[PDB]
Design a protein around this nucleic acid. Sequence first.
DNA 1: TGTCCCTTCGCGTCTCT
DNA 2: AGAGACGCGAAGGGACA
Length: 496
Amino acid sequence: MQWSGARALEALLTVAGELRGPPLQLDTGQLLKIAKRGGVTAVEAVHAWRNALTGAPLNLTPEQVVAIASHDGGKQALETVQRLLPVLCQAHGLTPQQVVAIASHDGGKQALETVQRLLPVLCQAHGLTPEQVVAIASHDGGKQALETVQALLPVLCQAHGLTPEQVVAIASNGGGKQALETVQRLLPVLCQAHGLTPQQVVAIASNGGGKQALETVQRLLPVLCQAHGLTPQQVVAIASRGGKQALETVQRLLPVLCQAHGLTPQQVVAIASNNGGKQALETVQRLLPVLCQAHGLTPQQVVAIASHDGGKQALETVQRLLPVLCQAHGLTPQQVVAIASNNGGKQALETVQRLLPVLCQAHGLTPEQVVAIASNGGGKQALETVQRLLPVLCQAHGLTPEQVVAIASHDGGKQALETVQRLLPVLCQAHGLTPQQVVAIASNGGGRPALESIVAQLSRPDPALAALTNDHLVALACLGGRPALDAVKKLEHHHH
DNA sequence: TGTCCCTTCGCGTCTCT
DNA sequence: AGAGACGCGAAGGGACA
């Protein structure tokens, strides 16, 4: 590709064509993902070692090879997985998937070598679990984070009062090293000068860019409180959810948004308190006029659309599509606002646009049912999964369309549908649950984990405490999902 | 032009009652 | 049942070789 070379392009494109063949069978999206991030050396490395990565002792799926290859240094990560996967699984007890997750970030090589070197000491001397070490390692710069937990976990616990879990949370994001050092430096001043609790500092620091959010809360908390009238809680929420950039934008736009456009401080805070809050704030300031007059909506509706991650994208997509969705497809504004007012609003809107007619015509759903599916977070995903799975769920597993639609009409609908497909046969035929009981467990937020937690308990039946008969577990699962089930595991281990 | 590390923003899912 | 928590990842920026 790179034009300090030529007809090297034929050689390169021919390498890519061959990956479409066996043992990987990569499709265009997969090659694209590799070329976009691992680059041409990752493309070449995947091709040179396609047999070794896909055979024993590694046995990686194509998708796992793609996940490793598609990051800066992917060639090194691929090399290093081949060397260390077996020892990490066998000697350190990790699964192949955990090794892959570690490997699948920029500088994956470094992270893999560092888990090898440090996992034991982190577990034995600092008391972490292997899962915790995996979570710290599985981000860009995971080497740095691992080494920084090793060096700092003791002072942060003993001098500053944090639990190991808190330290793990601060560490387990990109730039975990920086967030950890910055908490070490600034936790005292933030608690003593600005009146924050330890937990609030942890919350601010426990997201990508935590260092920056922390330094910015230090700098801007006084101004935002004593000049613009926000409370400390509100500053924390902004810092925690929208970071540095949202804090700076709030400082700039609070006056304009409140005085000129008529918003409450609460409303500005709510827009600010999400990933991309800066973008959401700047986009409501631009678009509030056109959205509210020029027919359209109330400020309250614009505020609701803006008040989710990707608010900017949702607002802009609502601007573009509200006319065509109401006029050509027959929806009301209110329905468009519901579809738009979740994370991924943009995506849900766009997917309703091209799928509303396919879902009614090719599968017999009504428009109202399509709106319901689309009006939760991940609407795009749920819609595409109903399109794909409705045939098989009805005709093989014997469910009704209304049942499929119920499962799909919660956040994570895609996950619940796919879990039902996977687990309905074993739940019914082997354990005596009815289809209706599986549907009822599935038709809640957290459907997938609740179905998986109920199968896990039914199949092992673990600690043979059978006073929870099948129907009781079904009711527990319906009422409180996995957490209800895990809690009851927690609560039995010896009071009984 | 590759490798490593850090930050911002967007999407999707689950828990909290 | 929606707020806020959870996790995963694309994409872009700098440092340095």
